[PDB]
């Protein structure tokens, strides 16, 4: 079971109990290292690297929904994560990808654009980008337009595909 989260963003992993009832539940990463778990009403953070920016939604627990939220996502954070409730193991695979422009701002003509994709340790990365224009250029691992244009300013979108899911990064452009 796999979902993908954009870098720097906030992502939530979902956990379900058998009846809409509160159950003590707890969370784990690929090593059996604890992020977040709860005691009745109160909440606690595990000694994992993650503990802060590891937080879950409180309101949910009477229904029996005990989510894990990682926020301000990092590439190294991609992990296979496992939530335990009423003796069940449920697991989700989370991967983080990031796109970046060659430099911060204001790029003008004949100058060239490079998008680079940072993929987490051990993963496939292919890229599709539709220009504001819509000419579609499929970079794969990095995408470069050797020389720049008027047509090109404005915001355009890249797609990264893993475990048959697609995630959107769109990059705003000033030319």
């Amino acid at each position: 079971k796999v979902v993908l989260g954009k870098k720097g963003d906030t992502v939530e992993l979902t956990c379900t109990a058998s009846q809409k009832k509160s159950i003590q539940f707890h969370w784990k990463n690929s090593n059996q290292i604890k992020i977040l778990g709860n005691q009745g009403s109160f909440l606690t953070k595990g000694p994992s690297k993650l503990n802060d920016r590891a937080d879950s939604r409180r309101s949910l627990w009477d229904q029996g929904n005990f989510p894990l939220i990682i926020k301000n996502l990092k590439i190294e954070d991609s992990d296979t994560y496992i939530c335990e409730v009423e003796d069940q193991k449920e697991e989700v695979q989370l991967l983080v990808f990031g796109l970046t422009a060659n430099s911060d701002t204001h790029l003008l003509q004949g100058q060239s654009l490079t998008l680079t994709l940072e993929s987490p340790p051990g993963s496939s990365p292919s890229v599709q980008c539709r220009s504001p224009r819509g000419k579609n250029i499929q970079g794969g691992k990095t995408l470069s337009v050797s020389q720049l244009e008027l047509q090109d300013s404005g915001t355009w979108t890249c797609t990264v595909l893993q475990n048959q899911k697609k995630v959107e990064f769109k990059i705003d452009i000033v030319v």
């Binding site: 059996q32 290292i33 005691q39 009745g40």
Partner: peptide
């Protein structure tokens, strides 16, 4: 206590921390 199940920490150790909050 932590566990952590490996990772060449090669830790001899277990860390036990207080706890509570389940009233039951």
């Amino acid at each position: 206590r932590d566990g952590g199940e490996n990772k060449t920490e090669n830790n001899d150790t277990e860390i036990f921390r207080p706890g509570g909050g389940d009233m039951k």
